[PDB]
Design a protein around this ligand. Structure first.
Ligand SMILES: [Mg+2]
Ligand SMILES: [Zn+2]
Ligand SMILES: [Zn+2]
Ligand SMILES: [Zn+2]
Lengths: 147, 56, 263, 57, 49, 61, 45, 113, 67, 48
RNA sequence: GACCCGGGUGUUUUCCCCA
């Protein structure tokens, strides 16, 4: 019924093995005179409503570095947007939420190695990043082939 | 890293640094100023490190 | 009762004829040589720098496939059976590769001869990548241009071809019996005449063709098997054959011990 | 298209990432293995499990 | 200068061949994202009617 | 550093720049654009100089 | 604090999250991050 | 994603016995043997060795599924012989055959070296 | 992209014969004769060298991203 | 508060000897470590 | 004793997959 049998040893030797790249884009938006988004590693204290993934793979500038293995739901771009502060200045020792998280997580079903990170400026002069992820896909039961 | 700064001219003024006499006993010299010299581009650290700044 | 007769012998391939053995024994020997003789192959790659145009895992896959000399792999232990923390010298061999291109013109080829054995078991002849001669550069691994460098450290472990095809010592085992089809084990497709439409086997001269008036013999069994064992250079042909026999013996002895200890 | 396109099977957990069928049931489903996909629905009650095992099996 | 620039960019970006405020009743799908899965697919896409 | 300071440093290093493949390609492209502009203006005198400059700069390997 | 590489002249430098995104020596607008210093290991399979 | 580890083809878990024997009561003097982490290599060898013994009246094996590394063997001997003794005799006989084969190959290789 | 180390079908090492194959073709030998001279008998091995396309020579023409 | 979470770790015993990973779950006596070599996450005892 | 979280657009359009 249109199936086929493949040699496992040929697969081990590199038959029909391929390479997969996926790129992610993000940029800093401008909402007003002085309301800008920032690429940064958000902290559990100064930001609220963080993603459930892990932020420990981000660098100081909020961007992951190439060569780092990533898994699903990991944060590859760290971005925060400002929020008007609440009355928490009552008795909080500077530990009050002023920013909201807008980070970009890796897709839940995908994982791989960070291949190349690009940082530049858009037409408007704001920061603009692109992250490319690389993985290898080996043939297995269910993959589609054709003559 | 900093020779092309506009303020570097006044920054380097009066500084004391180790100098290769060449004629080698290293000695200290006092910077009386700097003077850009066109056409005297020289390798600073590598081949690509062309520099026109000169230290008097 | 079993007999062996060698036709051609070389360091890399032996062509021999088995006789007075069952077909099952010959096939089990072929399967054991193909996928159950332990060899040594690179199993971990630590990439300290790779600025070449090839992906890191591309080069890792290429490295894993390079055959390494596995003569004394019997003395070596399996990685999972070594009580040492991390890897010691008795369960792993460490090779290191460092390649670089100097100058602003030309292309540098990275060959398997550049793999340098750093550490391994004492006085055991294992780990060195296989070379055809003293002047053979070996397997082409990568190519580099100016300011591209490859600096890696590879660890070789002992395993069998069941786990991954890179540990297989043999390339292809030709296997053949009954060139003249006296046993009628196959029925020959044809258009006009089946005799002149099918090429003769390469061992057809080693057996007398059936007589025109001969009747079918229902009491006969396959008795003589012709098989050629080709190796990748990690093990010699005689070593592959002998170690396949020894592996089969060990498997049967393990079954026997299990039976005797079951009671 | 017809009521034989939904039938209740018994689960067997297996490795790899594809649903596996005995080839005799590929006729009522009008399915072959060139890329087709099929849907699986899990009953969540004793009553529903009994209905599936006694009616749609 | 924004009129022509924005009109051309919008029509080429979205594929709706017309003015932005008349998106309905305009011929859609004129402009498509180039298929770069393989070389033959790109060549086929560039010669499609 | 500011944007203006970066531009000034880049111009200074361009004055110091003896040669760079990317910059040579950019210069050749700019020269070709200037040459087509001169061609469209029917200036037979400028185009000769631009052609000579392009011939001198070119001949890559 | 973190290294960067220019997209045209391949010149290494660093930024302090306040400098304009630009190569210091050729003024290119596109820069790339440098590889991580962590250990990278592959199964060679 | 769901692909099992390759070492599970031959590495035996601690809680899984290598060799489980259960009697088959439908016919007299018959046992069912379940080999774990084995395949046609051992099974066919054992089956074709046992098929030649005059006191073994039924021997067969099957691999239930190619994706699981095990096989099950059915053995059934005459009244005098216990089946497990026949299995042990088969193992020992094949071991002797392999030993003499190795010796003869070594002799021939040394002659033709 | 670059010559495979092992033949896919059987597993013979063909990764060390690319340079020799090109040298033989340079001298005017036919492709079949060149493959025969390298002792590639099985056609499964012959297709590996015969149908290989060398793309790394095109990737290397791009300026390296670091220095 | 599980100080070994999000820390690079190496496996010294079992079927994954000498593989670099990162600890993801640290409930207790059974650590979930993602492997850098393949794309998978495995449980492992703390002693390993 | 310093103690760890829990959230996700919408509307169009296009190009694909299995019948
Ligand atoms: Mg179909
Ligand atoms: Zn050890
Ligand atoms: Zn630059
Ligand atoms: Zn082959």
């Amino acid at each position: 019924e249109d199936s086929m049998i493949m040699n496992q040893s040929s697969i081990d030797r590199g038959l029909f093995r391929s390479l997969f790249f996926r790129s992610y884009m993000d940029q800093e938006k401008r909402f007003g005179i002085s309301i800008v988004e920032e690429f940064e590693k958000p902290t559990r204290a100064t930001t609220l409503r963080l993603k459930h993934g892990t932020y420990e793979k981000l660098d100081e500038d909020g961007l992951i570095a190439p060569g780092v293995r990533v898994s699903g739901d990991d944060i590859i771009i760290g971005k925060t947007t400002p929020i008007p502060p609440d009355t928490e200045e009552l008795g909080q020792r500077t530990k009050y939420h002023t920013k909201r998280d807008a980070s970009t997580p890796l897709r839940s079903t995908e994982n791989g190695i960070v291949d190349q990170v690009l940082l530049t400026t858009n037409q408007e002069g704001l920061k603009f990043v692109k992250v490319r992820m690389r993985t290898t896909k080996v043939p297995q039961i269910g993959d589609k082939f054709a003559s | 890293k900093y020779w092309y700064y506009p303020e570097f001219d006044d920054v380097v003024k009066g500084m004391y640094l180790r100098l290769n006499t060449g004629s080698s006993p290293y000695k200290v010299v006092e910077v009386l100023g700097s003077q850009r010299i066109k056409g005297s581009a020289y390798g600073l650290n590598s081949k690509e490190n062309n520099c026109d700044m000169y230290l008097k | 009762e079993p007999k062996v007769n060698i036709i051609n012998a070389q360091d890399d391939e032996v062509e021999l004829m088995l006789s007075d053995v069952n077909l099952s024994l010959a096939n089990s020997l072929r399967r054991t040589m193909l996928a159950e003789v332990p060899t040594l192959a690179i199993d971990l790659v630590e990439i300290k720098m790779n600025t070449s145009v090839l992906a890191d895992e591309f080069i890792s896959h290429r490295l894993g496939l390079i055959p390494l000399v596995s003569e004394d792999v019997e003395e070596m232990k399996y990685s999972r059976d070594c009580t040492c923390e991390d890897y010691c010298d008795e369960c792993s061999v460490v090779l290191e590769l460092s390649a670089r291109h100097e100058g602003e013109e030309g292309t540098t080829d990275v060959y398997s001869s550049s793999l340098i054995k750093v550490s391994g078991p004492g006085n055991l002849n294992v780990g060195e990548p296989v070379r055809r001669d003293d002047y053979d550069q070996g397997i082409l691994l990568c190519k580099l241009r100016n300011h591209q460098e490859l600096n890696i450290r590879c660890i070789a472990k002992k395993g069998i071809a069941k786990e991954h095809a890179k540990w297989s010592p043999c390339s292809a085992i030709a296997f053949e019996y009954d060139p003249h089809n006296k046993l009628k084990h196959t029925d020959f497709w044809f258009e006009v005449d089946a005799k002149k439409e099918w090429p003769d086997s390469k061992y057809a001269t080693w057996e007398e063709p059936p007589k025109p008036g001969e009747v079918f013999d229902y009491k006969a069994k396959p008795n003589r098997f012709y098989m050629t064992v080709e190796t990748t250079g990690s093990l010699k042909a005689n070593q592959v054959f002998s170690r396949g026999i020894k592996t089969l013996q060990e498997k049967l002895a393990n079954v026997l011990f299990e039976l005797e200890n079951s009671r | 298209l017809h009521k034989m396109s939904m039938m209740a099977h018994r689960v067997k957990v297996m490795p790899y990432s594809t649903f596996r069928l005995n080839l005799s049931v590929t006729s009522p489903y009008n399915a072959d293995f060139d890329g087709d996909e099929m849907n699986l629905h899990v009953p969540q009650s004793e009553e529903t499990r009994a209905e599936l095992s006694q009616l749609c099996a | 200068s924004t009129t022509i620039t924005s009109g051309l960019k919008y029509s080429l970006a979205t594929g709706n061949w017309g003015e932005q405020k008349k998106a309905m009743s305009s011929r859609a799908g004129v402009s498509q994202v180039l298929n770069r899965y393989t070389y033959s697919s790109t060549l086929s896409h560039l010669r499609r009617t | 550093l500011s944007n203006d300071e970066v531009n000034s440093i880049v111009k200074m290093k361009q004055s110091l720049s003896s040669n760079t493949g990317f910059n040579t390609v950019l210069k050749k492209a700019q020269l070709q654009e200037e040459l087509e502009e001169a061609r469209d203006a029917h200036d037979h005198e400028r185009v000769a100089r631009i052609e000579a400059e392009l011939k001198s700069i070119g001949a890559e390997s | 604090g973190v290294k960067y590489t220019c997209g045209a002249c391949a010149h290494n430098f660093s930024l302090n999250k306040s400098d304009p995104v630009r190569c210091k020596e050729c003024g290119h607008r596109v820069i790339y991050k440098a590889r991580t210093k962590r250990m990278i290991q592959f199964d060679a399979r | 994603m769901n692909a099992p580890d390759r070492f599970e083809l031959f590495i035996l878990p601690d809680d899984v016995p290598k060799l489980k024997i259960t009697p088959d009561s439908r016919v007299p003097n018959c046992i069912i043997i379940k080999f774990e982490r084995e395949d046609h290599t051992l099974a066919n060898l054992l089956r074709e060795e046992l098929a030649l013994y005059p006191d073994v009246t039924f021997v067969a094996y099957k691999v239930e599924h190619p994706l699981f590394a095990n096989f099950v063997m059915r053995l059934q001997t005459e009244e005098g012989t216990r089946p497990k003794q026949a299995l042990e005799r088969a193992c020992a006989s094949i071991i002797n055959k392999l030993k003499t084969l190795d010796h003869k190959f070594n002799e021939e290789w040394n002659i033709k070296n | 992209m670059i010559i495979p180390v092992r033949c896919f079908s059987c597993g013979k090492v063909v990764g060390d014969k690319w340079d020799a194959y090109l040298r033989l073709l340079e001298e005017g030998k036919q492709e079949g004769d060149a493959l025969d001279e390298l002792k590639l008998k099985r056609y499964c091995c012959r297709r590996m060298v015969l149908t290989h396309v060398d793309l790394i020579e095109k990737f290397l023409r791009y300026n390296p991203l670091e220095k | 508060r599980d100080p070994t979470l999000n820390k690079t770790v190496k496996i010294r015993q079992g079927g994954y000897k000498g593989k670099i990973g990162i600890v993801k779950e640290a409930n207790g006596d059974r650590f979930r470590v993602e492997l850098h070599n393949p794309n998978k996450t495995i449980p492992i005892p703390c002693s390993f």
